[PDB]
């Protein structure tokens, strides 16, 4: 529920944070599956809003 | 004065909020993208439209 409650602005911040640790792979290798699980719950929850959205920097982040 | 409407997407329980106070994600009935977590007092279920004066503000916690 604490992942459910967050607004999409904070969701987007979280995506940028994922991008940052994706740079810092070494930290990612410490908590990778947790990272995946929360990311997956985030995208499955807020999927329609973000897919209606458009941002090329966000696209490159996802890539 | 312009008044906006927003249909409930998802109720948000288990949070720490005052009795009677309800915390609910809604979507703009006009633009299906935008989702805002507001607060509703009365007895409410999912997928019903609600009335709104202010849109940019989102109703936060109330202990």
């Amino acid at each position: 529920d604490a992942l459910m409650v967050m607004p999409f602005s904070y969701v987007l911040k979280f995506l940028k944070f994922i991008d940052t640790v994706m740079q810092n792979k070494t930290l990612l290798h410490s908590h990778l599956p947790l990272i995946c699980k929360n990311l997956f719950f985030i995208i499955k929850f807020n999927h329609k809003e973000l897919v209606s959205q458009k941002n090329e920097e966000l696209k490159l982040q996802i890539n | 004065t312009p008044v906006t409407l927003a249909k409930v997407i998802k109720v948000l329980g288990r949070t720490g909020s005052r009795g009677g106070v309800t915390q609910v994600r809604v979507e703009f009935l006009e633009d299906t993208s935008r989702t805002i977590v507001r607060n509703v007092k009365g007895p409410v279920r999912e997928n019903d439209i609600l009335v709104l004066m202010e849109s940019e503000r989102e109703a936060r916690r109330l202990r």
Partner: peptide, 11 residues
Amino acid sequence: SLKAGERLMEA
């Protein structure tokens, strides 16, 4: 004492 999710949001 704050709530989880809120704490995650502000952090």
